[PDB]
């Protein structure tokens, strides 16, 4: 009756509709190496705009997922996406103890009705949590 799930962390950076990992939707999940234009938003986040049809839509991406290669006169930057995910030691998904999970990280979790997928790390004596949108389940 108890079940395990094999997961693989996605090969993407997360361009979210808000500068937060909790209660945000992906505007883009940009493949590792995608080239983009961004503006620094705060100490930890970039923002930018993309087109969904005729509409300009704003997103936010965490600073470690964007490598700045050049600076534009208007204060924007040209950047390459560095794909990785996170797990957190609590369900706020914001600071505290968090681990950078490498793109393609292979893990095991369990069905989570609340969408906070538990990761038990042997070397740690603590549960970390990863949201559904940061991984795939292999078919």
Q: Residue 109 belongs to a domain with what CATH number?
A: 2.30.30.40
- C-alpha 112/C-alpha 116 separation (Å) is 6
Residue 88 known to bind ligand: yes
Cα separation, 66 vs 82, in Å, equals 6
Domain that holds residue 85: 5-136
Nearest partner of 81 among 63, 70, 67, judged by Cα? 67
Q: Which of 34, 35, 36, 38 is nearest to 75 (CA)?
A: 38
Find out whether 30 is annotated in a ligand binding site.
no
- Note the resolution in Å, 1 decimal: 2.0
CA distance 128 to 134: 14
Pairwise CA distance, residues 56 & 47, whole Å: 13
Strand order in the sheet with 135-136: 106-109, 5-9, 135-136
- Residues making up the chain, counted from first to last: 139
CA atoms within 13 A on the CB side of 19: 12
Method in brief: X-ray
Beta strands across the sheet bearing 116-120: 98-102, 84-88, 127-131, 116-120
Contacts of 126 (CB under 8 A, 6+ apart): 89, 97
- Distance from C-alpha of 45 to C-alpha of 55, rounded to nearest angstrom: 23
How many domains, the chain? 1
């Amino acid at each position: 009756m108890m079940e395990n799930i094999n997961i693989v962390i996605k090969d993407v950076g997360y361009f979210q509709d808000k500068p937060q990992f909790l209660n945000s939707k992906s505007v883009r999940q940009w493949k590792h190496g995608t080239k983009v234009k961004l503006t620094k938003h705060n100490s930890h986040w970039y923002t930018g705009v993309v087109k969904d049809g005729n509409k300009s839509v704003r997103g936010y991406i965490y600073h470690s997922m964007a490598k700045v290669t050049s600076k534009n006169s208007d204060g924007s930057v040209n950047a390459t996406i560095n794909a990785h995910a996170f797990c957190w030691d609590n369900k706020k998904l914001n600071g505290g103890d968090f681990i950078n999970l490498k793109r393609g990280f292979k893990g095991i979790t369990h069905p989570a009705s609340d969408g906070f997928y538990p990761l038990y790390f042997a070397s740690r004596k603590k549960t970390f949590y990863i949201p559904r949108y940061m991984f795939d389940i292999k078919k």
